[PDB]
């Protein structure tokens, strides 16, 4: 079913401390596969997934030089925008650039993205038509005009509808054994009495890929979100993901509460019930 | 693979 590729660029200014820090990270679905750090002795794009390692050194040359090229633009950009915002060169600031594409079960293009942000607030975004730009404030209205005149959108779109999908498809095939495989949630339940009248049930889900999952509670068969709580899905550090849902119930009424787990790699949804 | 670098910056 639907897959993605996304790149995440982060450029921080260090006034006096030297050139801005740049970091680039590439994901297919929820799985990173490449990285770059200006401060790393390496000075090259580096593999972070097994199934990219097999790309010849001409892949790594072009990826290194392109991403270094953007790192230098980001450096000039920081000084331009400090200019636009009339900020002093004492302060440290941040440009983030996200982009990439989605493909459908069919392998075809669905959507593209290119979005930038100054000091962690929307600055400029490419629209869904991949031909127009949304500017967040007056500074980005200048950038927009420039980018409108330069036909920059046509550059993004050519990539997003073009090499972004061409290569998403190679990645998904090359490394199909990890990327198109699912790991189902291995689930258990925990019980902590909070008071002499109230207790907590916690529904766990462990080592699942990909990271999309829906935990839900019922009470005598009926959906319950009152007195329930979800955690941010968190990485395990081994390519899988963990998440839990808690609900607070009256003491001695635990058996009436059931937990519902839905995930890509489950033919039917799973169902749990506290077992002393 | 990554985009080519922005031909014109902000």
């Amino acid at each position, epitope marked *: 079913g639907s897959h993605s590729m996304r790149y995440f660029y982060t450029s921080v200014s260090r006034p006096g401390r030297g050139e801005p820090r740049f970091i680039a990270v590439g994901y297919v679905d929820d799985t990173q596969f490449v990285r770059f750090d200006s401060d790393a002795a390496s000075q090259r794009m580096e593999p972070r997934a097994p199934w990219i390692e097999q790309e010849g050194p*001409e892949y790594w040359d*072009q990826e*290194t*030089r*392109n991403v*270094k*090229a*953007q*790192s*230098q*633009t980001d*450096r*000039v*950009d920081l000084g*331009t925008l400090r200019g636009y915002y009339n900020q002093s060169e004492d302060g440290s600031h941040t440009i983030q650039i996200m982009y990439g594409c989605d493909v459908g079960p069919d392998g075809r293009f669905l959507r593209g993205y290119r979005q930038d942000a100054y000091d962690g607030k929307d600055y400029i975004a490419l629209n869904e038509d991949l031909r127009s730009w949304t500017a967040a404030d007056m500074a980005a209205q200048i950038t927009k005009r420039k980018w409108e005149a*330069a*036909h920059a959108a*046509e*550059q993004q779109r*050519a*990539y997003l509808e073009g*090499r972004c999908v061409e290569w998403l498809r190679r990645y998904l095939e090359n490394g199909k054994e990890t990327l198109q495989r699912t790991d189902p949630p291995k689930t258990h339940m925990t019980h902590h009495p909070i008071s002499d009248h109230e207790a907590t049930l916690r529904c766990w889900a462990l080592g699942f890929y990909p990271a999309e999952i829906t935990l839900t509670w019922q009470r005598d068969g009926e959906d319950q979100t009152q007195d329930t709580e979800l955690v941010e899905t968190r990485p395990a550090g081994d390519g899988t993901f963990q998440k839990w849902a808690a609900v607070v119930v009256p003491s001695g009424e635990e058996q009436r509460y059931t937990c519902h787990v839905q995930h890509e790699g489950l033919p039917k949804p799973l169902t749990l019930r506290w077992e002393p | *693979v990554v*985009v*080519g*670098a*922005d*031909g*014109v*910056g902000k």
Partner: T-cell receptor, first 117, second 117 residues
Framework: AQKVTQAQTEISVVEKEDVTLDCVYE???????LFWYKQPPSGELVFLIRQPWWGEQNEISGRYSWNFQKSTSSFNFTITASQVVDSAVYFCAMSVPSGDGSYQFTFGKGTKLSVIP | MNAGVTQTPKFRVLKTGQSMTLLCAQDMNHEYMYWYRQDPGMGLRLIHYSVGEGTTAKGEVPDGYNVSRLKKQNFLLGLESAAPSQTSVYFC??????????????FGNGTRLTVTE
């Protein structure tokens, strides 16, 4: 492999005529820019146009027209209603990101145009 | 308006083993600067270049030339000992830098140097 090739050294046409100057680039880089420059007998080198890799096939700019064909790795230059003024040397070029991330140029050897009245 | 890429002298003649500095200055606030030479049948061979204040680096034909970039504004081409091989047309050039990768090279007028025995 960084190369630009203008297999035409010398080529002449009569005035009030079309002429096309051929240019063949060769690179494995995918984010490259193509340029043409005019060098009049004066000697100076003048920017005419830039093609981005993502850019469309034909660009127009007055009497000037270019034809970009990735398949043919070609960027051939055409002048309509050629005036003796045109008469010059014409350089094709390509820029690609070098190791430090800076874009850097490969020039063709150039092609000597004589527009004879 | 802007001068662009200004270089002197326009003309120079040296005895073998004399020295000179070709001076180049650009009022456009460009980060990259270049020194080329242009010889019949060889088009534009780059000698040295510079991507910013304080950062010379070799091109495809450095030997017998050296350069300085004390300031962003200027790029000096030194011939410490002049050889008949160095009789050529020398062309300074600049480029805005990473703010605009698609930027072309801006050339100068060019020096015409003749080294003789």
């Amino acid at each position: 492999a960084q190369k630009v090739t203008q297999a035409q050294t010398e080529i002449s046409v009569v005035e009030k005529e079309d002429v096309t100057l051929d240019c063949v680039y060769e690179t494995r880089d995918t984010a490259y820019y193509l340029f043409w420059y005019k060098q009049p007998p004066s000697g100076e080198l003048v920017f005419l146009i830039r093609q981005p890799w993502w850019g469309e096939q034909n660009e127009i700019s007055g009497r000037y027209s270019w034809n970009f064909q990735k398949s043919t790795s070609s960027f051939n230059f055409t002048i309509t209603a050629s005036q003796v003024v045109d008469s010059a040397v014409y350089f094709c070029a390509m820029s690609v990101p070098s190791g430090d991330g800076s874009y850097q140029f490969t020039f063709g050897k150039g092609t000597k145009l004589s527009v004879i009245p | 308006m802007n001068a662009g890429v200004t270089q002197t002298p326009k003309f120079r003649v040296l005895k073998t083993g004399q020295s000179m500095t070709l001076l180049c200055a650009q009022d456009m606030n460009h980060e990259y600067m270049y020194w080329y030479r242009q010889d019949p049948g060889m088009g534009l061979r780059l000698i040295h270049y510079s991507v910013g204040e304080g950062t010379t680096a070799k091109g495809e034909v450095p030997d017998g030339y050296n350069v300085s970039r004390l300031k962003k504004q200027n790029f000096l081409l030194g011939l410490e000992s002049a050889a008949p091989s160095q009789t050529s047309v020398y062309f300074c050039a600049s480029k805005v830098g990473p703010g605009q990768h698609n930027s072309p090279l801006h050339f100068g007028n060019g020096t015409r140097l003749t080294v003789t025995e």
